[PDB]
């Protein structure tokens, strides 16, 4: 039925999460002048222009004038984009003739079958830059003599309900469809962002609604539905605390999206500088209905040693408990970049150490290492010969 | 109250020299007289303490009565200390007479180019505090009363609710219908440096001593109006322990008591 509570706990305590914000047309941002990128200025402009409009609905002169200037810049910018598109169209006609531009094929790596044997089907005329973006989906094991591309992934992003490029609701939809004679894999995910207040007109409060549905017909005769609602306010218990809360509800509905097992969980996140230690911690608890699971993560940074990286993670299930510690360090030596990662798992009393070295010149590693590995292989083969 | 503050017939005589209720019979010079204890049947009987000799040039069981009297500005402070060595018991009474905190604020008039001070002085300007000690390890009787006019107290609270609290209060509360009108009635807008509410002549006396009772305060509201029959204090007292209502009409030191004890 519903996946192990361990999956839900891990998904909840991903880490500190920053939600998506508004998008600015940029033609009206400087009223037709060069502008830099600031999150505060963009947010303020969307609310300011909406507020000035609201006031200009009533007979306030200064408001009416400020809104009028925005409209003039908005009309000028739009017409300029229209003219540029009309021109670029004609210039492209001359550059390529009546023949349309053809896109590049998709690389699939070495195969015993002739290279680019089927490249003709992966080259097509470029579309007229529609809203949706199409990405092909492949499989680990393809057919013996055919391309392994089954189905497509479609992504759409927008910001509807904006009056003049100001305001609206950040939106996002992503659907993957793989219809086949025996398979119907439809997996979907949607995100909506609501902004309540902005730093100049008050606190910065944002809310994210996420809804994901997964259905596979040949394997499961049921659809898994999941919803999540999160609220993040900057500076709940500090100047810039960035603390946030969230709720998650997943039901494996039979289709009947009503009668199904239901897993419900809650999460919270918080950042805090104490002395020389910066901390980013996220905790979460989920119950299935009954299994109860607890999970938290904690990234700790030390000012005196910036290079050292410290992550801690603990999971408790009910009775059963387990935690792990990961440390990371990087340096350079012998004209080569080194990175050492040390992971400790207390539940199994095992220590793992992993070092990765990259050299751009001199092959120094080959002389300084890998001499024992060759020796043992030679001895093994030589012993077999004996 | 102030009558209770100095009920001693000897200390009252000492004050005169420095210059149902029976006055103390005291004659003094350069302190001493007799204990004329007040009695509220057909006749009345006074007490008699032979050791009434009191001498404070610098201002049974023998006694040492020393009185400390210092008054600065609008604040007046009297301390009456009696010490009996054989008894090993000390009776100390300290009273304070100060207006206390003021809602009024100093204002600057640009045209005058001088500060305008709230020179106006509340008539009471008195916050009586009463606290006597029996003299044993744990014997004390405190009868402090809000001498400060009830109106003077109401103004300080209303000024606090206006300037400091209203800004903090959220708007969804103001969304409630008819609430802003009631708030406006409750909190009038300040005019000049004058009070928002002009309540005067109303006083609040509470009598409650921890040794005397665990939880029985006597609530006494006093109205002192000159217009009513050419003056006269109408005090209503509610004693919870005796279930007694003490309606009183004291004018020019008259003693009255419509005891309603049940």
């Amino acid at each position: 039925r519903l996946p192990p509570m361990t999956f839900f706990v891990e998904q909840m305590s991903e880490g500190v999460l920053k939600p998506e914000g508004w998008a600015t047309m940029e033609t009206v941002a400087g009223l037709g002048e060069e502008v830099t990128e600031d999150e505060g200025a963009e947010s303020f402009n969307h609310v300011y222009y909406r507020q000035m409009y609201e006031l200009a609905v009533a007979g306030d002169p200064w408001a009416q004038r400020e809104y009028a200037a925005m409209l003039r810049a908005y009309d000028k910018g739009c017409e300029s984009y229209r003219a540029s598109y009309e021109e670029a169209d004609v210039d492209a006609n001359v550059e390529y003739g009546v023949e349309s531009y053809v896109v590049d094929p998709i690389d699939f790596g070495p195969s015993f079958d002739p290279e680019d044997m089927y490249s003709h089907r992966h080259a097509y005329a470029e579309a007229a830059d529609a809203g949706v973006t199409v990405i092909p989906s492949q499989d680990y094991y393809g057919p013996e003599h055919d391309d392994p591309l089954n189905g497509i992934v479609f992504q759409y992003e927008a910001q509807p309900f904006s009056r003049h490029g100001w305001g609206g609701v950040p939106f996002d939809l992503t659907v993957c469809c793989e219809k086949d004679k025996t398979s119907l894999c439809l997996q979907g995910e949607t995100h909506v962002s609501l902004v309540h207040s902005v730093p100049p007109f008050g606190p910065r409060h944002i809310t994210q609604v996420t809804g994901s549905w997964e259905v596979l017909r040949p394997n499961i005769k049921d659809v898994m539905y999941q919803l999540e609602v999160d609220t993040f306010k900057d500076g709940l218990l500090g100047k810039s605390d960035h603390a946030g809360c969230g709720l998650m509800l997943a039901r494996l509905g039979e289709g009947d999206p009503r009668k199904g097992p239901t897993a419900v969980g809650v999460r919270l996140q918080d950042t805090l500088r104490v002395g020389p230690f910066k901390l980013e911690a996220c905790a979460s608890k989920v119950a299935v209905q009954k299994e109860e699971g607890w999970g938290a993560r904690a990234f700790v940074g030390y000012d005196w040693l910036p290079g050292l990286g410290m992550a801690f993670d603990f999971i408790q299930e009910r009775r059963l408990r387990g935690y792990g510690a990961n440390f990371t360090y990087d340096w350079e030596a012998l004209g080569a970049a080194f990175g050492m990662e040390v992971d400790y798992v207390a539940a199994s009393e095992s220590v793992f150490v992993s070092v990765n070295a990259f050299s751009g010149n001199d092959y120094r590693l080959g002389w300084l290492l890998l001499l024992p590995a060759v020796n043992y292989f030679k001895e093994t083969v030589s012993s077999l010969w004996a | 109250p102030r009558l209770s503050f100095l009920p001693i017939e000897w200390r009252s005589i000492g004050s005169a020299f420095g210059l149902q209720a029976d006055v103390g019979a005291s004659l003094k010079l350069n302190a001493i007289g007799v204990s004329a204890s007040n009695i509220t049947r057909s006749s009345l009987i006074p007490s008699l303490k032979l050791t009434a000799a009191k001498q404070f040039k610098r201002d049974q069981k023998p006694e040492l009565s020393a009185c400390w009297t210092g008054e600065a500005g609008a604040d007046r402070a009297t301390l009456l200390v009696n010490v009996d060595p054989v008894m090993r018991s000390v009776k100390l009474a300290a009273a304070v007479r100060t207006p206390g905190p003021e809602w009024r604020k100093v204002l600057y008039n640009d045209e005058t180019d001088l500060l305008e001070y709230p020179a106006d002085d509340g008539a009471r300007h008195t916050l009586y505090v009463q606290h006597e000690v029996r003299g044993r390890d744990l014997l004390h009787a405190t009868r402090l009363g809000c001498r400060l006019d009830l109106g003077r107290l109401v103004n300080y609270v209303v000024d606090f609710v206006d300037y400091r609290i209203e800004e903090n209060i959220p708007s969804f509360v103001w969304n409630v219908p008819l609430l802003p009108q009631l708030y406006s009635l409750l909190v009038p807008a300040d005019n000049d440096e004058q009070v928002r509410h002009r309540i005067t002549g109303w006083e609040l006396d509470v009598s409650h001593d921890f040794a005397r009772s665990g939880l029985l305060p006597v609530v006494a509201i006093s109205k002192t109006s000159k217009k009513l029959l050419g003056g006269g204090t109408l005090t209503a007292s509610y004693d919870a322990a005796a279930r007694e209502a003490g309606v009183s009409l004291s004018r020019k030191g008259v003693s009255v008591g419509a005891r309603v004890a049940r």
Binding site: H205, T231, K233, L236, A243, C245, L268, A283 | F172
Partner: peptide, 24 residues
């Protein structure tokens, strides 16, 4: 219990609604 403590922490972070307009 750990469950109760986590639920209480979730209730505490629910103060965002109190910080914003509440009981419209």
């Amino acid at each position: 219990a750990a469950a109760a403590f986590a639920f209480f922490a979730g209730f505490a972070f629910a103060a965002f609604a109190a910080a914003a307009a509440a009981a419209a």
